[PDB]
Amino acid sequence: KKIHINAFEMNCVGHIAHGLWRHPENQRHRYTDLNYWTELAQLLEKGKFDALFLADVVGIYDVYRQSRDTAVREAVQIPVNDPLMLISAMAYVTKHLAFAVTFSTTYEHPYGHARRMSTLDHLTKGRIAWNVVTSHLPSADKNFGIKKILEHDERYDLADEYLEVCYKLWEGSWEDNAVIRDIENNIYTDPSKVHEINHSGKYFEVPGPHLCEPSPQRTPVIYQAGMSERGREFAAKHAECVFLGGKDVETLKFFVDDIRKRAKKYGRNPDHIKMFAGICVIVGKTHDEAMEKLNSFQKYWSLEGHLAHYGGGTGYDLSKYSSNDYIGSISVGEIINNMSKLDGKWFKLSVGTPKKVADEMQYLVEEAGIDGFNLVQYVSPGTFVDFIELVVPELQKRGLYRVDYEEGTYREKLFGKGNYRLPDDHIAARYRN
DSSP: OOOEEEEEEESBSBSSSTTGGGSTTOOGGGTTOHHHHHHHHHHHHHTTOSEEEEEOOSSOOOOGGGSSHHHHHHTBSOSBOOSHHHHHHHHHHOSSOEEEEEEESSSSOHHHHHHHHHHHHHHTTSOEEEEEEOOOOHHHHHHTTOSSOOOHHHHHHHHHHHHHHHHIIIIIIBOTTOEEEETTTTEEEOGGGBOOOOEEOSSOEEOOOOSSOOOSSSSOEEEEOOOSHHHHHHHHHHOSEEEEOBSSHHHHHHHHHHHHHHHGGGTOOGGGOEEEEEEEEEEOSSHHHHHHHHHHHHTTOOHHHHHHHHHHHHOOOGGGSOTTOBSSSSBHHHHHHHHSSTTOSSBEEEEEOHHHHHHHHHHHHHHHOOOEEEEEOSSTTHHHHHIIIIIHHHHHHTTSSOSSOOSSOHHHHHHOTTOOSOOTTSGGGGGOO
16 A cells, blocks of 8 residues: 655666756765765655665667767766666665666677675565666667667567576576585585586576575565557566556556556466556645646756757657657657657656645556556756655655565565565566576
8 A cells, every 4th residue: 555666767867858957056066976875865764765676787878969968068967887886885874765677688689787786685685676688779789789680579579598597597596595605515505506507598508506595575676667569568478567658647547457468468467567667756834836747847858958968868859850740649749849848758757745746646556457666867856855855755644655664685675575486477487487
């Protein structure tokens, strides 16, 4: 009955709300400072947030105007630092706040990433999560020396075998009690309980065994946000937490059901999948305070930056179009106009007092059947601080948000005590013994 809330973030300057880095009270320019992050982790934990969701990109937005220039100038997801290098510091400073890091399966070998996750799972004591992602942005492909550029769908097929290898390493390589630290018999790890995974598929050939011993959750909690068809089929198959697109009951209600319907094919229990909706929040003690903030953000909302973001993301260079042209089925003019408005993103934008904001969140949850939200920033630490100071109490007063953390690993906090490792009905489990 409690709502899950993830704080959306990225190790760069311009994430979503482009142009806002100029806002006098913003701090995107501190992404290079370590203290910035630990403070954020600290603030988020104080606010009882389930976890810090870190997005990422290894490509550059060079679609709009046929150049990366706009992105660079506007700082649209460039520069970008590695998100995993942030986890330990943040983890050290917190006890419950979990960390979900975005990592593409398209470029870097799994064996290498398999160890990183295990290490983080170990160091964070089971508070690690991975937002599996296949990338698009072209620069990435060319920079990692990819010979054969794979197609959208074929990328998800590579992803499948990628998670497969990982599963095998995380779930099967080392038996539950391989490490025994038997001083009496000089046996640190029972060598009879460490095995090669002997994976051999279309994309990977991995002997194993894993270089790490069994960790708290073994397999990180699996995040998925791909909203394409293939993307949703991937979600239905692997994800424990799926981040849905949409800002209205109907839309969200559609995906939730679609992902559930798709999961039946894999004998997965729909209950073992948490649905999340995106949401940006501008609150105030009274309506005008909120408005004064939305007005203050509007002043810096850069259309040129969003144009660039849209370019890299859809593949459409709007400048090569005329306002009278038609892309989806909407005129490039409407597209460009709906892009210059603060509530034109594919996620809800709740503005107002704590009550109103909570009421709308509660409305999506109770009418769309979603399990949680992925809070989106417009200003840092503004929206996170405001939300935590005004909305959270309102949500707690109503028994919609936890008053304090549940003990255990992230998976347990998500699916209950005792459930620290993936359920029998989850694919990964096929590689356990």
